[PDB]
Design a protein around this ligand. Structure first.
Ligand SMILES: *CCS(=O)(=O)Nc1ccc2[nH]c(=O)n(CCC(=O)N[C@H]3CCN(C(=O)Cc4ccc(C)cc4F)C[C@H]3C(=O)N[C@H](CC3CCCCC3)C(=O)NC)c2c1
Ligand SMILES: [Zn+2]
Length: 422
């Protein structure tokens, strides 16, 4: 909560604002990433949130914190009016601006008395000069475009009223745009970036429970082949399916690869010491199944994009929950059943607090120590693995919306253990 597991850390005024105006004790990680990128980098965002829950804070918090104006563009009239009501209940001045609004409300908006102004895309397109005046006189913290996938002619819910939003960025090039959508289509996402003319946006995709990922944590034996043989099938050996093994160091990547090659397994390594071309080559041979297993040290699994990854193994404790989340999310993109196993020991590199002693920035040292503790608590836990992840990353509505995976044999090792004999 507060500033605990977030870097850069929210400052005390930011936490106070969150408590006082939104009634929350913590930012979720994606919410902080959006908010911070807006406040400090003035950066465009595309935020895909699978359920739609949790997006409001991303565009409401920044203008409230800095005391300026946020514009929210949406076609969902009744929901916008609802949100205006809720804001005013929290002492946040907000209004829904349209043609029928009085010149006194318009003057109040020009005077900066409203933190959050909701408009339809049609009104917005008809009143660009007003928006520019608000930017010149007060400063627009961000423009939020909800239902942003509606700008795409390739999607099923295109609205003509969204086309003209392409001019926001040319009329207001310094104002960040936060485009929000629930649609998990990569091409719709690219279309949003293109049609809104966003500039190097931060792109985030969150809000999933990933029902086809089975989660398990096992202790290491200390013998690499003894540890990995359960993931192999014999008669010669091979992996059960395409596999990524994440290792915390290049030395361990080389050790693991050497051991697996003793069994003539088709492997490739993948780390930052390689040329961009060499890593592309390994990625391509993995995609076409010339290699069955990639052993990698690259953070987040960046660049390992393959539809049918059936197994992810973390060989050693992961670095922290954010890297773990990104790295196992690489699995099972085709929707078929996959498994994500961590093999760990308390002596693992990513749990060695002595490696943090020399950090000079006190706030960063605390962040790294908190992230180690949180990772270790996950690995040692008896609780549902998926519930731990969703509680850390998602707000409570997302967790409650999850249906049909948690508590079943397909969810995780701890859920399985609570169904079997205990
Ligand atoms: C959502 C985009 S999409 O168009 O639907 N396509 C998609 C689907 C699946 C993917 N797997 C991937 O590796 N990638 C590429 C990178 C991502 O977009 N990663 C996303 C989605 C996958 N993911 C998870 O499933 C994590 C996960 C694991 C276990 C459970 C129980 C739930 C769960 F969600 C990871 C996720 C991701 O890494 N998100 C990044 C942003 C967050 C990082 C952590 C801190 C908060 C922000 C991100 O968007 N990075 C670019 C896809 C693509
Ligand atoms: Zn579970």
């Amino acid at each position: 909560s507060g500033s605990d597991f977030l870097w850069p850390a929210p400052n005390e005024e930011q936490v106070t604002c969150l408590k006082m105006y939104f009634g929350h004790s913590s930012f979720k990680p994606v919410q902080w990433k959006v908010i911070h990128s807006v406040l400090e980098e003035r950066r465009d965002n595309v935020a895909v949130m699978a359920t739609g829950y949790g997006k409001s804070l991303c565009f409401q918090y920044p203008p409230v914190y800095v005391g300026k104006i946020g514009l929210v563009i949406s076609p969902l009239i009744s929901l916008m009016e609802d949100q205006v009501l809720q804001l005013k209940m929290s002492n946040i001045p907000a209004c829904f601006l349209g043609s029928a609004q009085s010149e006194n409300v318009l003057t109040d908006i020009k005077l900066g008395k409203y933190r959050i102004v909701y408009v339809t895309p049609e009104y917005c397109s008809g009143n660009m000069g007003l928006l520019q005046q608000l930017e010149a006189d007060i400063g627009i913290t961000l423009i939020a475009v909800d239902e942003a996938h509606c700008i795409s002619e390739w999607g099923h819910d295109f609205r003509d009223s969204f086309r003209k939003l392409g001019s926001l960025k040319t009329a207001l090039p310094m104002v960040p745009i936060v485009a929000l959508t629930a649609t998990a289509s990569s091409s719709i996402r690219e279309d949003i970036v293109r049609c809104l003319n966003l500039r190097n946006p931060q792109i985030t995709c969150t809000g999933f429970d990933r029902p086809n990922l089975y989660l398990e944590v096992r202790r290491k034996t200390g013998n690499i082949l003894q540890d990995l043989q359960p993931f192999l099938v014999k008669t010669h050996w091979e992996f059960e399916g395409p596999t990524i093994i994440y290792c915390p160091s290049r030395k361990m990547t080389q050790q693991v690869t050497g051991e697996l090659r003793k069994l003539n397994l088709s492997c490739g390594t993948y780390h930052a010491g390689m040329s961009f071309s060499t890593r592309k080559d390994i990625h391509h041979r993995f995609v076409r199944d010339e290699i069955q297993c990639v052993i990698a040290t690259i953070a987040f699994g960046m660049g390992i994009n393959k539809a049918d990854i059936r197994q992810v193994i973390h060989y050693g404790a992961p670095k922290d929950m954010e890297s773990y989340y990104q790295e196992i999310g690489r699995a099972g993109r085709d929707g078929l059943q996959s498994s994500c196993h961590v093999l760990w020991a308390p002596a693992d590199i990513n749990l060695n607090r002595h490696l943090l002693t020399e950090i000079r920035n006190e706030k960063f040292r605390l962040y790294k120590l908190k992230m180690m503790a949180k990772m270790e608590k996950y690995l040692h836990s008896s609780r549902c693995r998926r519930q731990i992840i969703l509680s850390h990353f998602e707000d409570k509505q997302v967790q409650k919306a999850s249906l049909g995976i948690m508590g079943t044999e397909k969810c995780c090792d701890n859920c399985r253990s609570r169904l079997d004999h205990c």
